[PDB]
Design a protein around this motif. Structure first.
Motif, mmCIF file in Angstrom:
data_model
loop_
_atom_site.group_PDB
_atom_site.id
_atom_site.type_symbol
_atom_site.label_atom_id
_atom_site.label_comp_id
_atom_site.label_asym_id
_atom_site.label_seq_id
_atom_site.Cartn_x
_atom_site.Cartn_y
_atom_site.Cartn_z
ATOM 1 N N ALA A 117 91.518 70.057 64.613
ATOM 2 C CA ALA A 117 90.509 71.095 64.752
ATOM 3 C C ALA A 117 91.044 72.424 64.192
ATOM 4 N N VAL A 118 92.368 72.578 64.254
ATOM 5 C CA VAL A 118 93.068 73.762 63.750
ATOM 6 C C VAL A 118 93.509 73.512 62.314
ATOM 7 N N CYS A 119 94.151 72.364 62.101
ATOM 8 C CA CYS A 119 94.640 71.995 60.768
ATOM 9 C C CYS A 119 93.488 71.881 59.762
ATOM 10 N N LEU A 120 92.385 71.284 60.198
ATOM 11 C CA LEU A 120 91.197 71.105 59.357
ATOM 12 C C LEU A 120 90.544 72.443 59.011
ATOM 13 N N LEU A 121 90.225 73.226 60.037
ATOM 14 C CA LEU A 121 89.581 74.527 59.851
ATOM 15 C C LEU A 121 90.480 75.521 59.116
ATOM 16 N N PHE A 122 91.748 75.582 59.510
ATOM 17 C CA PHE A 122 92.701 76.512 58.901
ATOM 18 C C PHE A 122 92.966 76.188 57.429
ATOM 19 N N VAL A 123 93.269 74.922 57.131
ATOM 20 C CA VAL A 123 93.542 74.505 55.754
ATOM 21 C C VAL A 123 92.312 74.673 54.865
ATOM 22 N N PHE A 124 91.170 74.167 55.329
ATOM 23 C CA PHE A 124 89.921 74.263 54.571
ATOM 24 C C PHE A 124 89.558 75.722 54.288
ATOM 25 N N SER A 125 89.586 76.559 55.327
ATOM 26 C CA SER A 125 89.270 77.983 55.181
ATOM 27 C C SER A 125 90.240 78.666 54.216
ATOM 28 N N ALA A 126 91.510 78.254 54.259
ATOM 29 C CA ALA A 126 92.543 78.817 53.387
ATOM 30 C C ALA A 126 92.273 78.465 51.927
ATOM 31 N N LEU A 127 91.946 77.199 51.664
ATOM 32 C CA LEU A 127 91.637 76.775 50.303
ATOM 33 C C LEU A 127 90.397 77.507 49.828
ATOM 34 N N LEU A 128 89.411 77.585 50.713
ATOM 35 C CA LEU A 128 88.184 78.311 50.443
ATOM 36 C C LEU A 128 88.500 79.796 50.255
ATOM 37 N N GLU A 129 89.623 80.228 50.850
ATOM 38 C CA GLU A 129 90.064 81.612 50.759
ATOM 39 C C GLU A 129 90.466 81.925 49.324
ATOM 40 N N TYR A 130 91.254 81.028 48.724
ATOM 41 C CA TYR A 130 91.682 81.201 47.350
ATOM 42 C C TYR A 130 90.529 80.968 46.398
#
Length: 61
Positions: free
Chosen positions: A40-53
């Motif tokens: 729930a953290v790894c999924l949201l954090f990683v996805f949001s981060a990639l979406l961040e770049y």
């Protein structure tokens, strides 16, 4: 307020290690719950981060 950022995440990060419980043992019960709690953290954090770049390119700040 600024520190609360890194602090809040690192708190999650702690959970990333604990919630998963892979290194601790990961017998079976901890594995079932782990894959749903920290993901729930790894999924949201990683996805949001990639979406961040990817926005790095969208916004181009």
């Amino acid at each position: 307020l600024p520190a609360r950022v890194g602090l809040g995440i690192t708190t999650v990060l702690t959970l990333t290690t604990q919630s998963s419980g892979s290194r601790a043992s990961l017998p079976k019960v901890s594995y079932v719950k782990a894959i749903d709690i920290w993901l729930a953290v790894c999924l949201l954090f990683v996805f949001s981060a990639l979406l961040e770049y990817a926005a790095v390119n969208f916004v181009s700040r």
